[PDB]
């Protein structure tokens, strides 16, 4: 309860950690720790009745967030781990169920059958992109196919639980916590050309309430980099 890191502090009370490993350290690298290990709270999204889902690309959502956005442009390479806190706050009269998963290397498919999606439509800079519950048209040039029952990757949406996941059920649970190590082939990669993780939030059983209650339940995502090291002189 009431953990602190750097100059930021959140309040907690079960944590699922990666593929069984904890994030740890390894020309020559430098390791900065006093100015990157803090909780960058992304701003809150709203969960309405006919909502579909959200996704963030992970070393892209912190590209403008303070000093971590400066070390992405100054240093060429780097490798980090992450620690994700998700918590939505509803009363005892709401109902629903989320799925918080963290997909590594989530390559998405374009709407047009021949092209590839552009940069502005894969990742919103510190802003959540949205799935849809209908199809995306074929006639538009280059946009991400966001049919939520195929999860944008051409896969079954039910089988997405093989990745490290955690259920948020508003009857009994309220929050979720994930710890993800660095999963890549090369031991140190670029941070602009590549997005090695993807955090997805999908509502399976949709929100429902009576007449009178507040018609939206906000979600809060809080990310903190762990054991980061860059490469340069």
């Amino acid at each position, epitope marked *: 309860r009431s953990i602190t890191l750097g100059n930021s502090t959140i309040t907690t009370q079960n944590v699922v950690v990666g593929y069984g490993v904890w994030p740890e350290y390894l020309d020559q690298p430098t390791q900065p720790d006093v100015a990157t290990c803090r909780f960058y709270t992304l701003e809150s999204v709203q969960w309405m009745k006919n909502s*579909a889902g959200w996704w963030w690309k992970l070393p892209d959502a912190l590209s403008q967030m303070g000093l971590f956005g400066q070390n992405m442009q100054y240093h060429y390479l780097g490798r980090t781990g992450y620690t994700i806190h998700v918590q939505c706050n509803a009363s005892k009269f709401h109902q629903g169920c989320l799925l918080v998963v963290c997909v590594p290397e989530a390559e998405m498919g374009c709407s047009n059958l021949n092209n590839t999606p552009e940069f502005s439509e894969l990742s919103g800079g510190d802003s959540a992109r949205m799935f849809t519950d209908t199809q*995306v*048209g074929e*006639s538009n040039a280059k946009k991400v196919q966001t049919a939520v029952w195929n999860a944008g990757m051409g896969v079954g949406v039910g089988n997405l639980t093989i990745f490290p996941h955690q259920w948020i059920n508003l009857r009994t649970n309220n929050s979720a916590t994930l710890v993800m190590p660095y999963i890549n082939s090369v031991p140190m990669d670029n941070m602009f050309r590549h997005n090695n993780l993807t955090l997805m939030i999908i509502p399976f059983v949709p929100l429902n309430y009576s007449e009178g209650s507040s018609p939206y339940v906000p979600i809060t995502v809080t990310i903190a980099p762990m054991c980061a090291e860059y490469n340069g002189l």
Partner: antibody
Amino acid sequence: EVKLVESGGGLVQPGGSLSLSCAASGFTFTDYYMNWVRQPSGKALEWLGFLRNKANGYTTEYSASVKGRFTISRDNSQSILYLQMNALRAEDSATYYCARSRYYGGTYRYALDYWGQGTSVTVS
Amino acid sequence: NVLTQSPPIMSASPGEKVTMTCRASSSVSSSYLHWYQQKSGASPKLWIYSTSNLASGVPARFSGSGSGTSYSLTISSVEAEDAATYYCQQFSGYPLTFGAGTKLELK
């Protein structure tokens, strides 16, 4: 009750521009998909495009023939719906409707339940 | 994908049982095919959605059926207010194509 009126039609030169407007009353406007269906003089109907509700990000999906020429948008303050037309040709003389969509189960079948009274646009 | 209705003009006396068809070029799913009814000089109205379910405020004489690529709408008893034009709609990919139209003239 669902009450949809639309206005803005009239005569316009080929190669010109014209902006329609469809007003909605009697329901929550930020919850339903809003379509646009035109129809020529006693012929088969044609579908133009719709605009999604607030829970899906207010995106648009035009048809193939009117892509780049027409533009569907809504106004943030009050409940009204627009359609911006550009580069009109001789075959765009039709009767324009303004339909609503709804969720039947929790699914979205592609039906159009409530239609407007229909405005007319001619070119010459 | 195109829809071809048949027949274009169809006449029926009051009291008989009549039917029309709506044939697609490719396979259209059974939950994405609807029927409309437009009277003379009026806005169209939704009649049957998801190929077998009645709309709100429609009489119980109408009933749709069919699957695969051939669908049909049959009227049990013809009355005096159901003389109009009927369209069928589909969706397999964008755009949403309407049918040609079957006109029902009373006898």
